Amino acid sequence: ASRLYTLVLVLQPQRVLLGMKKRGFGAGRWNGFGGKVQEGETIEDGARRELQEESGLTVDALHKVGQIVFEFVGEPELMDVHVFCTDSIQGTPVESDEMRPCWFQLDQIPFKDMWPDDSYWFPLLLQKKKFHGYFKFQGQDTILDYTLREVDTVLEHHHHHH
Length: 162
Ligand SMILES: COc1c(O)cc2oc3cc(O)c(CC=C(C)C)c(O)c3c(=O)c2c1CC=C(C)C
Ligand SMILES: [Zn+2]
Ligand SMILES: [Zn+2]
Known about the structure:
Largest sheet: 9 strands, mixed
Number of helices: 2
Structural class: mainly beta
CATH superfamily: Nucleoside Triphosphate Pyrophosphohydrolase
CATH architecture: Alpha-Beta Complex
Radius of gyration: 15 Å
Bound molecules: the ligand COc1c(O)cc2oc3cc(O)c(CC=C(C)C)c(O)c3c(=O)c2c1CC=C(C)C, zinc ion
Number of strands: 11
Number of domains: 1
CATH topology: Nucleoside Triphosphate Pyrophosphohydrolase
Helix content: 10-25%
EC number: 3.6.1.56, 3.6.1.-
Binding site for Mg(2+) 2: 50, 53
Strand content: over 45%
Cofactor: Mg(2+)
Domain Nudix hydrolase: 1-130
Shape: globular
InterPro entries: 8ODP (IPR003563), Nudix_hydrolase (IPR020476), NUDIX_hydrolase-like_dom_sf (IPR015797), NUDIX_hydrolase_CS (IPR020084), NUDIX_hydrolase_dom (IPR000086)
CATH class: Alpha Beta
């Protein structure tokens, strides 16, 4: 019981491009660019699609930086979140109806305005370290427990429908 998602962090040496959810679920919070991997598309096509739709950006390559599992109390189904980062982007960031991209200096990242797990794994992302992580949530604002480990290589899940 799981659902497959992507999260894309556009990360340059001094800055990170985040985006502000403009409405709907998670409105008011800054996040990486991502969403549900649909049926008929691969994980990496889904990551590129969500980045294109949300930021208007194209990337030459995505690096696999980590894997996050979300569990929610009252929901039996886990979120399987494949996390990517990209150094090299093409195009000018422009908002959609869903998301507005903005650049943040790396020491200025607005963790109080982001999802609570971000404070945990973002330091590893910024140190250029790969990670596996798990967060048990109660509601949107509360983490009940977590496990986060640095990994040498991101484990491959072999999803054969994606
Ligand atoms: C990756 O972006 C996040 C994130 O960091 C944490 C998230 O936490 C959530 C917490 C939740 O309770 C729920 C369930 C909603 C109810 C009120 C039952 C969640 O959907 C989430 C999140 O989706 C969430 C996200 C966004 C998901 C992506 C961009 C893969
Ligand atoms: Zn599927
Ligand atoms: Zn997976």
